[PDB]
């Protein structure tokens, strides 16, 4: 996560807010209005990378490179 007050402030009212990884579409609807004047008040961008360490085939891997295989 990182500060985004340079991009996500003007104000910017698009940021409506309200089980693990639940999504949802009186009611609890509330929104921001970010202005560059806002410091904890400022917009921050976040990416949460969640890693599926299941036993299935691997499909995202780091920048590592293979050797030849060696046996016995």
């Amino acid at each position: 996560a990182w500060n985004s007050n340079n991009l996500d402030s003007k104000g910017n009212y698009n940021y409506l807010y309200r089980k693990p990884f639940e999504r949802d579409i009186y009611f609890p609807l509330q929104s921001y209005g970010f202005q560059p004047t806002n410091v904890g008040y400022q917009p921050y961008r976040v990416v949460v990378l969640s890693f599926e360490l299941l036993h299935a085939p691997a499909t995202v891997c780091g920048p590592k490179k293979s050797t030849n295989l060696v046996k016995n």
């Binding site: 299941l54 036993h55 299935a56 085939p57």
Partner: protein, 92 residues
């Protein structure tokens, strides 16, 4: 209409090979000897509940059964899974 499920609906719980072993696991399974509901093409595909999950089957040779539909309300007001099995391929 109903009939006995016997043993049906056992599936590989995880993608790990194991052999000659009695592995014990907690998961969603069709209970042994439980009643299945049974249905026919003679004027029979209403919206069933799905509950925790569905075992399904058909006995076939005509291949007139060609897909499945799922969701909460099935009416564009949510995204709805369609599975098809047409000609040779599963298509989703």
């Amino acid at each position: 209409a109903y009939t006995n499920s016997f043993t049906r609906g056992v599936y590989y719980p995880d993608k790990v090979f194991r052999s000659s072993v009695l592995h014990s696991t907690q998961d969603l399974f069709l209970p042994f000897f439980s009643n299945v509901t049974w249905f026919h093409a003679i004027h029979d595909n209403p919206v069933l509940p799905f509950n925790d999950g569905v075992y399904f089957a058909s006995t076939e040779k005509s291949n007139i059964i060609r897909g499945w539909i799922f969701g909460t309300t099935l009416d564009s007001k949510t995204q709805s899974l369609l599975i098809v099995n047409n000609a040779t391929n599963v298509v989703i």
